[PDB]
Design a protein around this ligand. Structure first.
Ligand SMILES: Nc1ncnc2c1ncn2[C@@H]1O[C@H](COP(=O)(O)OP(=O)(O)OP(O)(O)=S)[C@@H](O)[C@H]1O
Ligand SMILES: Nc1ncnc2c1ncn2[C@@H]1O[C@H](COP(=O)(O)OP(=O)(O)OP(O)(O)=S)[C@@H](O)[C@H]1O
Ligand SMILES: Nc1nc2c(ncn2[C@@H]2O[C@H](COP(=O)(O)OP(=O)(O)O)[C@@H](O)[C@H]2O)c(=O)[nH]1
Ligand SMILES: [Mg+2]
Ligand SMILES: [Mg+2]
Lengths: 332, 352, 258, 330
DNA sequence: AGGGGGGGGGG
DNA sequence: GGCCCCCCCGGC
DNA sequence: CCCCCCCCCCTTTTTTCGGGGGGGCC
């Protein structure tokens, strides 16, 4: 509706709206007529369409009437301790399947099992996870398990072995452009050539972020009230991308090599609010793609950037990390 | 009331800096029905909370500024009764779950879902008595939340999208997890320029009848604030109160006590490098930490004061910054702040 | 300047006990007509309204309307130490920082008068303008207890449906589902166990286990309840007093599937 | 179950029912058969990695010993159930100290996944095991031996379940193909074994996915391309090309080749790193520190990837680490 | 390690 | 007899 | 009463789930 965000408004409803996950969507569709759906483990980067995919599968399998009575969904917002897993999940799995109505049996396949969707399974403790090993196996004939996670390493080996793994690929401009273009036409958003491709490139495998950026750009254009097409500079500004001029000044200061000047420039730069991750990514792109540096310089800078990114991913101060990275690069 | 609080703007049209951000906020508030979740990030003391309040006032009526404080009771797995101070408004809600430490997740799993799972009674500006809109919840200092709370929020912000909207203000996005960033609309709030800070200070002075011979006075305050506006206003007020409401060209810049203590520590470490000096630094660190001074701020200020020493060379500064970078991550992954501050100080003294 | 000599102090004790859990800080406006109060729940989801008329009090008089934000928990603390049959009065003065509760009795020995502190609670111009509510009825409270306590163990929803000649309580959960239907039933020898019901349009609204359980905890106040359900307005649960009543506007839960 | 067994997943549909259907554990199977054929059945400790067939083996042994009505004559306790000090004290002791109900026989207790049990329960079970040994026997199934107390280990005869050999997996695959009327190319079989890592559950899951992927299983043969598409794993040719470009080509072309290979089929960086590690493990390096640097840097990169982060930076780091490590060869 | 305290030997 | 609540280990 | 060996004994509390024990209401 008009009172919902575009990310939720254009959420897939069926399995035919999934764009770049055909390798698993085809298997899921075949399971509709095969009726032998196994335990599933959906893993991949954020914003790839895993929860949407499982919701669409459950809808197409059961119907809006049987969805409530055949699906049990537990996520990180509910207590999922060992006791909860041993009591509630066990009781639901061991229960008999709800009796479908003639309407549902006529218009839906109505598979003879229920589904438990453990979203954000990577947040569950190992002890709690170990309690499901026999639960899934014993009641496989009446219940099926769907574990959705972002880090596959957080799932214990027995559960990964029991579940069938499904990897969701990143959504880039080469496979997710069609959906973004369709959304743009539906919303009557006018954009210049390459704007959607730039949005998808900035998103880096996150269609939700791209949709949010498109919505923000459309809102800005509507508020402007000029009718001009959306450009790429405005999109970059809305995405927090550092201007190329600032990057040029940064690399020139690094090439200068003076510690005091670099420190002063970093102090001035950090007052603008630019995210450290974006700066590091832009610096990595510029330095790696440049042909004016030798093999050793790139060899060292790659490791330096990797270390800086790893340290930043732990939630540290951006100023200190950025200053250290720039100082190290200047001494390469 | 303090000048920093008495002259706070209460509307989007009253903002005096970052006009582009004001235009973006106005564009967002033009059609607030489809407003996505918002995440404001930028330097501290720039006006992120003021801009959020202005946006809320643009969306709802002026009645967003009538605030109340209530107390909420929570129970943990050990039957431990915890109290949370909730700041509420008829049109919006404000919460700071970090005040409960590792128990912040409970607030996500008990309070927010209570508000988002069902409707509200709106007997004002309505005909039926039931609300026909969404509620905006402001989670202050989202970067301080634990990973579990953010993971719990992941589905909460999605399955109640059109009933509740979240506006999260933070000074850094590094602690924020990728799923939360993906689910939020990023808004960058740059710090005000020196000229804008000087103009605001001049307006305050001329509205408070404060004698000022040269405007350059205010300019210095801006160079002493490093982009912060709240610090600038507080420093102006303190200087006016310390100089009989008359600023002079010879008036010194008033620094807070903790900054002076950190400077003493820095110029004691530089001058003396010994185990006894390290013990005295341990005592100083205990004194600093016992009085509600965050460890990260102490480390940052100590590092940036060491790098400002005119006697140290490039190699010493590089070693100091490398050690600071390592020990910042050590602090982020540790509990005892002094256990890492002492290590950083010892490494710095060794490298000198 | 103001007195509210009660016919029975237990009546006021039950009146206060009926909504102590829902709200704790409520403004009482004491006009010559009687006592009026309306407090918004701290979550801005439940409105506790209440009014006691001049008829209920044994002897009520006032010279100037006054609003007192006096606490409820302290009210219970004061009233719990009292006897059963008495004639509580609420005397005060021109500038009251405290209100003297005169626990008078027919006998001159069983007197337990106390003093209750007053506290400044802000009050707003809340409105309860009537709406064309689809259904409204009244039925005893023992059935409410036997139904709510029964259905709470099976689910967290006490969904109420009001159809012609039918009143349905529905509660579904993990263990199963439970539905209880009550219908117009009048006993000539025992009129108290009767339902007085009038509906205009069908209504169905899902309500919560904790809210109704708390409400029925305080249902000892009135032996009869009052249901009022609409289609777009907050349905209200009322407890009839001697001359007034105690209303509870509770917002219905949001429906995601519809 | 519901309806028929055809609706069950292949992992559960093909669960062995008898002992002769367990493959890859010939020594253990023969030993248990001999034990149960002449009455000398000691306490058993089946230690092994996931997907080896310990639970299936013990279930088949119980069925052979007791028969069809084996579920009512054995006490099966697993991590899904509550196994505390009180449970061991009361229920297990009563089961071990009481005669059979349905028919004459000895008492069997199967503590599956006992590695998730508390130390107090393990200590309590010692005297229960050593006191009712005449009429009761204990079987414990484990994946990690460090979670079991030494006292418990001393009282059980240890049997280790090795990863499934190649021939056993081929035989099971042939049986599954015969049952499902499916055809598999030899290269597809080799790829399946290579990616299987000795787990039969992976074999069954990947085979079911491949069957679902086929346009028409009646007259379509699964090839290596189908397996790679279903699992999304990189092809060996892509790994070889990426390694060649990294080793000999310059930075720009190596980066371009890696990006093109990853974007052609949406490959993941961790699988590429794993394949490169497998390929380089067979390289006859002339120096040791080169291998040390390779291993350390690749482990660091894998650990960083496990926690997320920027993928492009991680790939550049992989390339730089490989180049720097091979620079030491000279 | 530093300081206080109890008990046998000298005084 | 059953909840409900409080204190205390946790590696080999 | 006062002094000198010979040794002994004291210098002291905060903590994230899950399980166990033992006391108190009822
Ligand atoms: N394959 C997709 N096809 C179409 N839209 C998608 C797709 N993936 C994501 N989106 C869009 O982005 C929005 C969010 O998708 P999600 O289902 O939340 O991704 P996700 O994989 O569940 O993210 P995580 O791992 O739980 S943080 C959807 O409502 C869609 O509008
Ligand atoms: N030796 C085997 N022969 C045939 N199939 C096997 C064999 N081992 C495992 N499988 C197959 O994989 C499925 C699961 O085997 P399991 O008995 O559950 O392995 P497991 O050793 O008990 O796993 P863990 O250690 O409890 S995680 C079986 O139903 C079989 O279909
Ligand atoms: N005149 C003026 N003052 C502002 C403005 N924005 C912020 N301020 C002042 O700066 C003070 C601190 O801003 P604050 O909201 O605390 O920033 P935050 O803590 O980073 O979110 C405020 O109390 C205001 O007095 C503005 O736009 N115009
Ligand atoms: Mg999701
Ligand atoms: Mg098993």
């Amino acid at each position: 509706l008009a009172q919902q965000p575009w990310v939720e408004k254009y959420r897939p409803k069926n399995l035919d709206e999934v764009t770049a996950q055909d390798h698993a969507v085809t298997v899921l569709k075949k399971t509709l007529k095969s009726a032998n759906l196994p335990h599933m483990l959906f893993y991949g980067p954020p914003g790839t369409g895993k929860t949407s995919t499982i919701l669409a599968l459950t809808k197409e399998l059961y119907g809006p009437d049987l969805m409530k009575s055949r699906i049990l969904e537990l996520n990180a917002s509910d207590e999922r301790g060992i006791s909860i897993v041993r009591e509630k999940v066990k009781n639901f799995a061991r229960l008999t399947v709800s009796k479908p109505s003639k309407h549902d049996l006529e218009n839906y396949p109505c598979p003879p099992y229920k589904i438990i969707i453990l979203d954000e399974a990577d947040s569950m403790t190992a002890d709690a996870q170990s309690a499901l090993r026999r639960t899934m196996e014993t009641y496989s004939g009446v219940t099926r398990f769907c574990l959705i996670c972002n880090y596959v390493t957080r799932i214990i080996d027995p559960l990964a072995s029991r579940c069938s793994k499904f990897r969701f690929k990143a959504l880039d401009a080469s496979n997710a452009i069609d959906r973004l273009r369709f959304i743009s036409e539906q919303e009557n958003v006018k954009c210049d050539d390459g704007v959607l491709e730039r949005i998808l490139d900035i998103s880096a495998g996150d269609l939700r972020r791209g949709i949010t950026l498109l919505q923000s750009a459309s809102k800005g254009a509507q508020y402007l009230g000029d009718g001009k097409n959306i450009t790429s500079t405005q999109v970059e500004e809305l995405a927090g991308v550092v201007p190329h001029d600032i990057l040029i000044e940064i690399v020139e200061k690094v090439k200068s090599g003076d510690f005091d000047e670099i420190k002063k420039y970093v102090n001035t730069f950090m007052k603008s609010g630019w995210s450290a991750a974006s700066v590091v990514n832009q610096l990595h792109e510029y330095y790696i793609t440049n042909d004016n540096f030798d093999t050793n310089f790139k060899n060292q800078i790659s490791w330096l950037l990797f270390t800086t990114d790893s340290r930043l991913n732990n939630g540290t101060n951006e100023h200190i990390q950025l200053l250290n990275l720039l100082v190290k690069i200047s001494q390469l | 009331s303090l000048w920093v609080d008495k002259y706070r703007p209460k509307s989007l049209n009253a903002l005096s800096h970052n006009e582009e951000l004001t235009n973006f906020l106005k564009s967002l508030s033009d059609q607030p029905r489809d407003l996505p979740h918002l995440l404001l990030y930028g330097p501290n003391g720039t006006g992120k909370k003021t801009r959020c309040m202005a946006l809320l006032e643009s969306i709802f009526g002026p009645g967003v500024y009538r605030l109340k404080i209530d107390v909420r009771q929570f129970v943990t797995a050990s039957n431990r009764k915890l109290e949370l101070n909730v700041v509420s408004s008829p049109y919006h809600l404000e919460i700071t779950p970090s005040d409960m430490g590792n128990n912040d997740r409970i607030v996500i799993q008990e309070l927010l879902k209570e508000v988002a799972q069902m409707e509200q009674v709106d007997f004002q500006d309505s005909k039926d008595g039931l609300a026909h809109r969404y509620k905006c919840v402001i989670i202050n200092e989202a970067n301080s939340l634990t990973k579990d709370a953010q993971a719990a929020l992941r589905r909460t912000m999605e399955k109640y999208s059109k009933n509740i909207r979240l506006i999260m203000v933070c000074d850094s996005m590094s602690p924020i997890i990728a799923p939360i960033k993906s689910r939020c609309l990023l808004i960058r709030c740059p710090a005000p320029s020196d000229s804008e800070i000087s103009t605001i200070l001049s307006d305050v002075v001329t509205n408070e009848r404060i004698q000022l011979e040269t405007k350059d006075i205010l300019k210095r305050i801006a160079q002493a604030s490093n982009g912060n506006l709240r610090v600038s206003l507080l420093m102006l007020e303190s200087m006016a109160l310390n100089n009989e409401l008359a600023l002079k060209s010879s008036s010194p810049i008033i620094k807070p006590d903790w900054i002076i203590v950190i400077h003493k520590l820095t110029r004691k470490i530089v001058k003396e490098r010994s185990v006894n000096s390290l013990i005295e630094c341990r005592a100083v660190l205990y004194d600093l930490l016992a009085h509600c001074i965050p460890a990260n701020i102490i480390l940052k200020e100590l590092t940036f004061s060491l790098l400002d020493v005119e006697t140290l060379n490039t190699t010493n500064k590089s070693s100091i910054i490398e050690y600071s970078s390592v020990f910042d991550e050590r602090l982020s992954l540790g509990n005892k702040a002094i256990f890492h501050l002492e290590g950083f100080i010892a490494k710095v003294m060794c490298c000198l | 300047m103001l007195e509210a000599k009660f016919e029975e102090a237990s009546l006021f004790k039950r009146i206060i006990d009926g909504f102590k859990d829902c709200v704790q800080l409520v403004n009482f406006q004491c006009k010559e007509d009687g006592i009026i109060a309306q407090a918004v729940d701290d979550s801005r989801v439940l409105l506790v309204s209440l009014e006691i008329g001049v008829e209920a009090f044994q002897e009520y008089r006032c010279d100037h309307p006054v609003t007192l934000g006096m606490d409820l928990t302290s009210l219970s603390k004061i009233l719990r130490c009292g006897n059963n049959t008495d004639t509580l009065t609420l005397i005060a003065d021109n500038t009251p920082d405290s209100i003297i509760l005169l626990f008078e009795d027919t006998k001159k020995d069983r007197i337990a008068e106390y003093s209750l502190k007053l506290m400044d609670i802000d009050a707003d111009f809340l409105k309860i303008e009537e709406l064309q509510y689809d259904s409204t009825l009244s039925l005893p409270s023992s059935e409410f207890s036997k139904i709510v306590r029964d259905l709470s163990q099976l689910s967290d929803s006490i969904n109420i449906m009001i159809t012609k000649e039918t009143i349905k309580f529905v509660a579904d959960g993990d263990i199963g589902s439970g539905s209880v239907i009550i219908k117009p039933f009048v006993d000539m020898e025992h009129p108290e166990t009767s339902i007085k019901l009038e509906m205009d349009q069908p209504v169905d609204l899902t309500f919560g286990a904790k809210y109704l359980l708390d409400i029925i905890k305080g249902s000892s106040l009135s032996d009869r309840v009052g249901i009022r359900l609409s289609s777009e307005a907050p349905a209200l649960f009322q407890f009839d007093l001697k001359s007034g009543f105690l209303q509870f506007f509770l917002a219905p839960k949001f429906n995601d599937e519809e | 179950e519901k309806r028929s067994k055809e609706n069950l997943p292949w992992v559960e549909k093909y669960r062995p029912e008898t002992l002769d259907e367990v493959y890859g554990q010939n020594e253990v199977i023969t030993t248990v058969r001999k034990f149960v054929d002449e009455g000398k059945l000691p306490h058993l400790l089946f230690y092994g990695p996931p997907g080896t067939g310990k639970t299936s083996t013990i279930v088949a042994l119980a069925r052979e010993i007791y028969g069809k009505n084996y579920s009512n004559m054995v006490l099966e306790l697993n991590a899904s159930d509550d196994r505390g000090i009180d449970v061991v004290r009361n229920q297990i002791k009563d089961f071990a100290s009481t005669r059979q109900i349905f028919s004459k026989g000895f008492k069997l207790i199967i503590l599956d996944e006992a590695d998730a049990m508390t130390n107090a329960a393990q200590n309590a079970l010692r005297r229960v095991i050593e006191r009712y040994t005449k009429n009761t026997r204990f079987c414990v199934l484990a994946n990690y031996a460090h979670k079991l107390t030494p006292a418990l280990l001393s009282r059980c005869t240890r049997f280790r379940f090795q990863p499934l050999p190649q021939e056993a997996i081929e035989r099971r695959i042939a049986n599954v193909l015969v049952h499902e009327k499916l055809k598999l190319s030899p290269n597809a079989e080799k790829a399946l074994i290579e990616l299987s890592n000795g787990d039969m559950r992976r074999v069954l899951n990947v085979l079911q996915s491949c069957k679902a992927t086929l346009d028409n299983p009646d007259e379509d043969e699964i090839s290596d391309d189908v397996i790679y598409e279903c699992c999304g794993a990189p092809r060996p040719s892509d790994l070889k090309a990426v390694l060649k470009s990294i080793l000999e080509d310059d930075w720009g072309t190596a980066h371009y080749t890696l990006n093109k290979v990853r974007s052609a089929k949406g490959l993941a960086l961790i699988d590429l790193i794993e394949g490169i590690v497998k390929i380089l493990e067979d390289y006859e390096l002339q120096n040791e520190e080169t291998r040390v640097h390779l291993l350390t840097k690749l482990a660091d990169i894998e650990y960083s990837i496990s926690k997320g982060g920027n993928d492009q930076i991680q790939g550049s780091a992989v390339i730089g680490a490989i180049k720097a490590s091979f620079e030491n060869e000279t």
